[PDB]
Design an enzyme around this catalytic site. Structure first.
Site: not given
Length: 291
Positions: A38, A103-104, A127, A269
């Site tokens: 995201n 991330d996702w 991350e 990130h």
């Protein structure tokens, strides 16, 4: 750092919708599957893929509702993304794969790996999503903002009406300054406000202080699988980081079996926007050892 996206578009129909993906490198052999999170797309991997394509097939899809993929009227819970990516992988006939995840994209990759362990030959990550026990562990510069994204009404006004995940979070979580052409590439999928639904559901699904309970259970389960798995792992980390600060990367270097860690220098990130050349060259050097 390059701003172009020199990749021909490919499309596949999955669960009634068209998904876009990059597919370069050899047409055979073990593919390297890149999964964004995201609020990005395969554009996040544009400067990393060229280091890998000379030796291996590279596949990078845009998640449903994002990038150049179709944008159905879904709630965009994590389970919707799980269904679409499971169907994407089977439509391409993939058997064994190497995962490169963020991330996702990392929650999706680790959940897929736990369910199909015999098909994962290696995992490169950065991350990534893990249970965050308390708000104290979320970094101060971003704490109140993420708390607001998860507050009724206030979060939708920020992310959907004001596009705060694209205009705020993305540039504030890259150390070097992003250019207009790069930010306009990231803005393009979300020019219609109603299409920002996945960008708001994602932060509301992060496992923080035990909520939401269904996602906390799923992430605790793939972390327990990851800690017992002998699969080769490559973990990139930056300073100060966001989900994986330096002290956390040092703990994971011990608690994840067969794990090599790589310090990328300054990063928050979206590490791929601060040091894509080291991330791509280190993945390319690590892949041969997996055979």
């Amino acid at each position: 750092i390059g701003t172009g996206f020199p990749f021909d578009p490919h499309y596949v129909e999955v669960l009634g919708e068209r998904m876009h993906y990059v597919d370069v490198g050899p047409r055979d052999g073990t593919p390297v599957l890149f999964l964004h999170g995201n609020p990005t797309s395969s554009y996040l991997w544009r400067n990393i893929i060229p280091h890998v394509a000379p030796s291996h097939r590279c596949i990078a899809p845009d998640l449903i509702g994002m990038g150049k993929s179709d944008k159905p009227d879904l709630d965009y819970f994590f389970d919707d993304h799980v269904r679409y990516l499971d169907a994407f992988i089977e439509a391409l006939g993939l058997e064994e794969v190497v995962l490169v995840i963020h991330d996702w994209g990392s929650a999706l990759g680790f959940h897929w790996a736990k369910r199909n362990p015999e098909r994962v030959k290696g995992i490169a990550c950065m991350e990534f999503i893990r249970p965050i026990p308390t708000w104290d562990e979320w970094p101060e510069f971003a704490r109140e903002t993420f708390q607001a994204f998860r507050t009724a009404d206030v979060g939708r006004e920020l992310i959907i009406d004001q596009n705060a995940f694209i205009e705020g979070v993305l540039p504030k979580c890259v150390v070097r300054p992003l250019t207009e052409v790069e930010m306009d590439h990231y803005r393009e999928p979300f020019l219609k406000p109603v299409d920002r639904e996945p960008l708001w559901r994602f932060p509301n699904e992060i496992p923080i202080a035990g909520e939401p309970a269904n996602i906390v259970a799923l992430v605790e389960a793939y972390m327990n699988w990851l800690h017992q798995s002998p699969v080769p792992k490559l973990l990139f980390w930056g300073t100060p980081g966001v989900l994986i600060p330096p002290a956390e990367a040092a703990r994971l270097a011990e608690s994840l079996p067969n794990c090599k860690t790589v310090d990328i220098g300054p990063g928050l990130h979206y590490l791929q926007e601060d040091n894509p050349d080291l991330i791509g060259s280190e993945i390319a050097r690590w892949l041969p050892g997996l055979a």
